[PDB]
Design a protein around this ligand. Sequence first.
Ligand SMILES: O=c1[nH]cnc2c([C@@H]3N[C@H](CO)[C@@H](O)[C@H]3O)c[nH]c12
Ligand SMILES: O=c1[nH]cnc2c([C@@H]3N[C@H](CO)[C@@H](O)[C@H]3O)c[nH]c12
Ligand SMILES: O=c1[nH]cnc2c([C@@H]3N[C@H](CO)[C@@H](O)[C@H]3O)c[nH]c12
Ligand SMILES: O=c1[nH]cnc2c([C@@H]3N[C@H](CO)[C@@H](O)[C@H]3O)c[nH]c12
Ligand SMILES: O=c1[nH]cnc2c([C@@H]3N[C@H](CO)[C@@H](O)[C@H]3O)c[nH]c12
Ligand SMILES: O=c1[nH]cnc2c([C@@H]3N[C@H](CO)[C@@H](O)[C@H]3O)c[nH]c12
Lengths: 248, 248, 248, 248, 248, 248
Amino acid sequence: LMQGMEVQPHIRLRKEDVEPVVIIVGDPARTEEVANMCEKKQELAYNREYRSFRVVYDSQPITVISHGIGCPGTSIAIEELAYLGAKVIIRAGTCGSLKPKTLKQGDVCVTYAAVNETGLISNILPEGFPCVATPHVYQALMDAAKELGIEAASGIGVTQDYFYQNGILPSKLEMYSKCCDVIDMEMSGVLGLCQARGIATCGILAVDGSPLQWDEGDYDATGVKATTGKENMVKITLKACANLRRQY
Amino acid sequence: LMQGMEVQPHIRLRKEDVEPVVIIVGDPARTEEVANMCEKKQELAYNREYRSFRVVYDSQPITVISHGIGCPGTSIAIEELAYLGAKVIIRAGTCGSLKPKTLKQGDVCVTYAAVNETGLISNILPEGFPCVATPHVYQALMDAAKELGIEAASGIGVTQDYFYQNGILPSKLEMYSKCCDVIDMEMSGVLGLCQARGIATCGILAVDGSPLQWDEGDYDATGVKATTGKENMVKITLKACANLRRQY
Amino acid sequence: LMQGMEVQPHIRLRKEDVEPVVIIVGDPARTEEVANMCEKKQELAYNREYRSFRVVYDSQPITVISHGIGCPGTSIAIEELAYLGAKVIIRAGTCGSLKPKTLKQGDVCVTYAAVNETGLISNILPEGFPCVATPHVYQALMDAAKELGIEAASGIGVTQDYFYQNGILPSKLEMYSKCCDVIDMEMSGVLGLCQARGIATCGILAVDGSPLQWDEGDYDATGVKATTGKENMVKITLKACANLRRQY
Amino acid sequence: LMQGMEVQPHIRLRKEDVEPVVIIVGDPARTEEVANMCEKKQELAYNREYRSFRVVYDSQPITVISHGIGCPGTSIAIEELAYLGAKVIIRAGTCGSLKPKTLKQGDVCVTYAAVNETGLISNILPEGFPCVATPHVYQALMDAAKELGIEAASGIGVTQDYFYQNGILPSKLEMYSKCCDVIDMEMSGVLGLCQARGIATCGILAVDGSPLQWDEGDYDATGVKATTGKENMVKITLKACANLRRQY
Amino acid sequence: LMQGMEVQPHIRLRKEDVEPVVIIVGDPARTEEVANMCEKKQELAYNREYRSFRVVYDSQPITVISHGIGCPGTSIAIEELAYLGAKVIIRAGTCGSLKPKTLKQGDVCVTYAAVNETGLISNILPEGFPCVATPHVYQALMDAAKELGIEAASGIGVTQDYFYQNGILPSKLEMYSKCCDVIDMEMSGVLGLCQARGIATCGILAVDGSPLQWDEGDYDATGVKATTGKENMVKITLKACANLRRQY
Amino acid sequence: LMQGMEVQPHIRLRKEDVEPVVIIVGDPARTEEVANMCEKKQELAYNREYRSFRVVYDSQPITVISHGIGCPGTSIAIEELAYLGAKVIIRAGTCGSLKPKTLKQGDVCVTYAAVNETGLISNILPEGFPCVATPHVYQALMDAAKELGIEAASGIGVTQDYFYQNGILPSKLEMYSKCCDVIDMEMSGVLGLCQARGIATCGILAVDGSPLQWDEGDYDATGVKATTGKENMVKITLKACANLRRQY
Ligand SMILES: O=c1[nH]cnc2c([C@@H]3N[C@H](CO)[C@@H](O)[C@H]3O)c[nH]c12
Ligand SMILES: O=c1[nH]cnc2c([C@@H]3N[C@H](CO)[C@@H](O)[C@H]3O)c[nH]c12
Ligand SMILES: O=c1[nH]cnc2c([C@@H]3N[C@H](CO)[C@@H](O)[C@H]3O)c[nH]c12
Ligand SMILES: O=c1[nH]cnc2c([C@@H]3N[C@H](CO)[C@@H](O)[C@H]3O)c[nH]c12
Ligand SMILES: O=c1[nH]cnc2c([C@@H]3N[C@H](CO)[C@@H](O)[C@H]3O)c[nH]c12
Ligand SMILES: O=c1[nH]cnc2c([C@@H]3N[C@H](CO)[C@@H](O)[C@H]3O)c[nH]c12
């Protein structure tokens, strides 16, 4: 006879450590930044790239945890969170703009879908599966942005299993720019895997540059524009998550 | 020097015949059924499988046109409608249920996305492109349903380039049923192509059977359950479309 | 215990309405044009894009039915016709030329094979399956053309799930032109599915333009050249079909 | 400034050594067997797996050359033959039966098409390209068979890049048997490459066993049944080739 | 005019911080464990999942840095390390056994190649590219193992973009077990990307369980067997890396 | 009840004719060239493209057999050799250079891996399988070259199912040149299939030209440079094989 593990092996959490609403972010440092915007915080665990907190925002307890860069490491956090009872997962991340005329450093984009280029989604779901947000979760993010008076684009992203565009094979970014708005490394994986696991999901992203213009120096992840965009994104996410959390 | 054609060659419409909001249906016969629910109707053209009306619902003029069975015939209608000024396209169709316990003949499902198995989308858009609805169009359909007090599921469909499941190669329906709610032959093509052409889009579908249970006689497209489901779908679609039409 | 349907659900025919030899055409209007070239005609049904006649040519009864634009809608007609006892199916359609120097508006091409770009054939048959005509059916068409003194090219076509060549992704027509003669939207589906169902098959197509030269206005489906080509194609098809019909 | 080579590097022939009609066979030994059925024979070259003769049959000069097992070695022979002026290429080979009830050791099958599973065709031609015979070449083979009173099946083959079916991955033969009659290792490559190079082409194959029943000993390449089948195939091929040769 | 960044944006290192020989490990915690086995250690940076040290082993300075779980996060580390002058990269990681009879918890396997199932390698290199070790780097690891008297298997791994095998689509592990010895989430990406960037490379892996037997509790990443295996792996890696470092 | 064949059907050998170490070459003529460098030789069989010898070099008996051009014909020899007890198979072949600056006619390259473009490996092994040499076999070849004072490059090759680069579709050689060293038509098939069958394997190739420069006449397979390269390759292979043979 077999038994479950006391603590999930990678995120090192037990079921009492996980709320039905979870905010996931790529960078362990951002979990603390989120926590510092809340009334109460408690750091739970920090193993590998997975740092977790319970936070209280608008009297609602929410889980905040880092997933690391890329779909594979993210798949582990999502599977372990799902086993522990997560019901809503929102990725609050950073991204490049593929529309440098209208989405610029500091801007926020709520991604209701993402073009999949990841090996994760290509192997765990049938070909042609849409990596799409749950409508009421997208609506909670947009309604939060509206209430706060914070501008938020609504867009389709593209997700790749790499950052740098160094070529044996031709870059696809020019083509992608003709049908989507932003680019990152986890979104289609998050949306797709959450849909597959019956977890309600959406993404929101703050722009740090444009890879179409990296050659002209359009990148500044640490700068004031990016820092302010991320702050705005977190304000929207926390508002939306307290509203969702109430339903559980 | 070249000039545009006076009437588009397949749908046989001119720009003055096309409203910015369009309802598309598979069957020529359904265009008249829609039109009979309106204050005013005018049949415009009927060429090949493309029968078109201008209708007035809640004082708003809306185009209604049939697209025929399958993505290819549908692609022609959408391309020619787009050239003529269509800004919003909603497919109001029929479908099979892949969730026979909960979605049955007569039920309506608003499809915010669809798994693509079509050659159309596989060839005109990059691999991994999400065939997804425009959020505000989905919201208009759901809000119309709520207002009318008509139950409408929210789901992900799958779209195939065939109807019958006679096999040399194994049927994929059991697998699709694990991650999809409904099945049809145009939705991913509509959503995907409209996204590509910058047309706001969504789908709504009335269930006529369950292909997982066709072998036990779970199909009745002409029956009272399916007929009532389609009537409900049309009520929701017309209400949502009048609201959308007002913004133009 | 289950029973068959009295009338097939889409084409709305019973087995007594279907001959072992069937001519299929994309446009419902062409079924009547064919019928008007015969000694006797009887319209049978008209549902959705499927209009059907029994015709008598050279004392032989033949079925004539429209299949609509594209492989998906066509697959339904072919499956339902096959269930009702069809043994020979010939598509008499229209097409673009990929050899604008030697195949021009008004010319006829008997297609003994087609390059498949359809989602239908890609999903129902193994990769690499040849969408090819049955030799004795091709021979009947060619022998009819010879007897009538009507010039008919012999060629390989390409079949796509779309008409317009509007690009996120590069058009493939230039490449296709280096290995085939004509382009349409149903041929590989017809040939492939018929082969799969053990139905003897071939295609014949009348040229209405060249998509390589659409930008220079090389398209005229309603014009005298195209109209005459279609008339010639129908004369060949009817002669060949009466000969085949005799064998049953 | 560059010049052509005097003799082609693999087959080691000059243009005066090559007739416009060529019979290709897999085994060097079969070139002599063919030549022994003719009025006159002259061995030309033998390099690697490529052994060549000029033969005279019914007063017509024809090239006979071996291509070796598999599409890659065969591609070299065809390319070099084409450079030297070949206009018609017919493969007279051996094969397995996928229809063991009706096609048995000693039987002959004229293959007007073949399912492609070769890397050759997958890489040199677009996906979905039909590996198909030239109708008038198929007709010459069938007419020769009819004249000789030798039974010849007409069928579709499948071509693979291997012979043995030892598995890490599942064998596909049972599936192929639903839609194909025979199996070999060169046919789709011959038909496809000849089509691409504008060479008129067809295949004819003598059955030596059934791989579906190899486990029960259904294989005898050297036996009297197979030897007689190959003799019959050669009789048909030589007769058809003399007729074709006359047109040049 | 553009300039390079002073510190690379993700790993936060400058060229003077990077040695030509680099050991990469998945877990930030393992960088310290490696460093504790050396004569001298200096922690350099810790940003996101990227923690780095300079270590001195057998008088040779070597970089040690964590890459996080999965190819995408790893690609960033390798690209930025390569820009900074890395010439040799060895992944010292953990893995599952696909050969549970012979490779068990605590065992070490030097992987000279890996089956690629990653989106990274599928998109940055041509199809069929071998994710393979540089022979002299493999030899340095094996020679170090032989010198130390520590048993090390030599094998081929498989790399996937996920850890958990929860299925909508069938698990491929049983098939992989026929042709692979171990399974992890980064190896094919490391080997393949290093080959592409002209970095000499190999992998070594300590077994922590067998996913074929996870259902029977064959997993213990923190246990004494796995801990000893990792210690042995590190001993081999440090010895091989000092030898390699000397050549620069 | 079934029995094995006395003599394998294609190579026409019995188990007593096959040594555990086998040298395979594409050209039947090269088997004799190899044999003439040995103390003792015995020709065993010659059927189709498969000519075989037992040779004695440095008192060790080794099998030498031709496999013909291309993976398919080669797969037969390898399967039949494996059934007869072959344990080590080394391909000693010829190749084109993709690095015309540093690998030129007459140069030798030991290929420890090959990019797969063959239909053989694509169908018998999972996607992403590395076609890689067995490390100790590569080491035996390199150690032989070092001992003999013969320069030998160490490289990754690419293997295609064709020789000539004649285009419907764009040539891939320019891209391949950015990630590998040499090009041939059997290597990935040999390495991959041997790995699959548990046979230890490596490849060594002598350069006869550069296909990137065929247009400038960079090809001379019969010339003194190529002839000397092949002689050098054979000297290395025979030395390495006698060493390996001793272990059995
Ligand atoms: O321009 C970009 N391209 C790809 N990914 C990202 C990101 C996101 N942040 C991380 C990379 O810095 C990674 O998690 C990715 O999802 C920000 N900007 C870009
Ligand atoms: O059970 C089903 N499977 C696939 N398509 C459909 C449909 C839709 N209606 C048409 C086929 O009846 C076609 O347009 C398809 O999209 C209704 N039910 C089903
Ligand atoms: O130039 C062309 N490209 C693609 N299809 C067609 C057709 C055929 N006629 C219909 C489109 O008008 C459709 O059934 C297609 O098969 C005529 N011309 C062309
Ligand atoms: O049962 C079979 N399977 C696959 N190929 C062949 C052949 C043909 N003959 C050669 C293999 O014996 C090869 O050229 C292949 O095309 C005969 N029988 C069979
Ligand atoms: O059984 C396994 N399957 C897949 N990956 C891993 C690993 C490796 N360690 C991390 C997951 O624990 C990840 O980096 C992966 O590469 C250890 N064991 C296994
Ligand atoms: O430049 C080349 N391209 C492809 N193959 C080869 C060869 C090898 N020799 C044979 C072709 O001559 C074939 O077996 C192939 O593997 C030599 N040179 C080249």
